[PDB]
Design a protein around this nucleic acid. Structure first.
Ligand SMILES: [Zn+2]
Length: 252
DNA sequence: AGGTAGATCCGGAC
DNA sequence: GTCCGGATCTACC
């Protein structure tokens, strides 16, 4: 899921688990657990804590418990659900948190790409995976100025810059391509080649694009179809190592 | 010193 | 087999 969906999960999941106390933690794919490295220590420390809140930073969900924070990333296909311990488990369930009330928070992920880190709360923001996370795209801390500073100092493409989690938090591939199209900027453009007028326009389109979503598509996945604004066929290439879509006529 | 590219994980799809 | 992907983490200057 992308940032908008993660924000929806955060909002909808909180009420389904707030106030429940963990009685057991079962792990069926140890590799999801990144800290503590030992999945048995991860399970043991969570036992007995009550869920007090659920926040989001970028695409990471931060579960707040009594003493610890559990930081989770669903990557492309992870998903959470709350259900009864009496019912059979859905396929690909790799981590289950069993609550004292007989309900469970289940983590499912066909690809097994997601990650979980648990740290004492006061420490989570200073450790991986949250440590060097950049500003939320919809916050005043993400400004044209901040984008300009980062763009000027690198030799990488504008796309590579926007995908960098230390530049802006959790702005995905789809939003990068749609934002560049709305701003009229080619994805393969060196970040340092953007003018301040372009940087400002890029910043505004990033905010409206992700803002509209959190609250169809022009180019993402529309390879070979006509551009919705000019009819020119949308092209797809590899930029910054990822599938990249753009209109050759409208983006410069 | 520290940017930055390359490697990495995993299992559907084509 | 091959491709693909977020955010590390490793290694090359
Ligand atoms: Zn166009």
């Amino acid at each position: 899921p992308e940032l908008p969906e993660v924000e929806t999960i955060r909002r909808t999941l909180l009420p389904l688990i707030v106030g429940k106390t963990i009685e057991d933690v079962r792990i069926f794919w140890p590799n999801i657990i990144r800290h503590p490295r030992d999945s048995e220590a991860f399970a043991a420390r969570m036992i007995g804590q009550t869920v007090r809140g659920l926040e989001r930073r970028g695409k990471f969900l931060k579960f707040l418990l009594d003493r610890d924070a559990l930081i989770s990333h669903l990557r492309m296909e992870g998903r959470y659900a709350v259900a009864s311990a009496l019912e059979p488990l859905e396929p690909h369930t790799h981590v289950v948190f069993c609550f004292t009330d007989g309900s469970e928070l289940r983590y499912r992920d066909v690809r097994k790409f997601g990650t979980m880190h648990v740290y004492a709360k006061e420490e989570a923001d200073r450790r991986p995976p949250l440590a060097e996370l950049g500003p939320e795209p919809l916050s005043p801390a993400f400004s044209p100025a901040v984008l300009a500073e980062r763009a000027v100092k690198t030799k990488r493409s504008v796309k590579a810059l926007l995908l960098d989690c230390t530049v802006v938090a959790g702005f995905g591939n789809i939003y990068v391509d749609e934002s560049l199209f709305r701003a009229g900027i080619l994805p393969g453009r060196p970040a340092a080649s953007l003018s301040s007028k372009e940087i400002e326009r890029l910043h505004e389109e990033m905010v409206a694009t992700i803002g509209e979503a959190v609250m169809h598509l022009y180019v993402y996945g529309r390879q070979g179809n006509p551009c919705k604004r000019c009819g020119t066929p949308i092209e797809k290439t590899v930029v910054a190592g990822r599938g990249t879509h753009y209109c050759p006529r409208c983006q410069r």
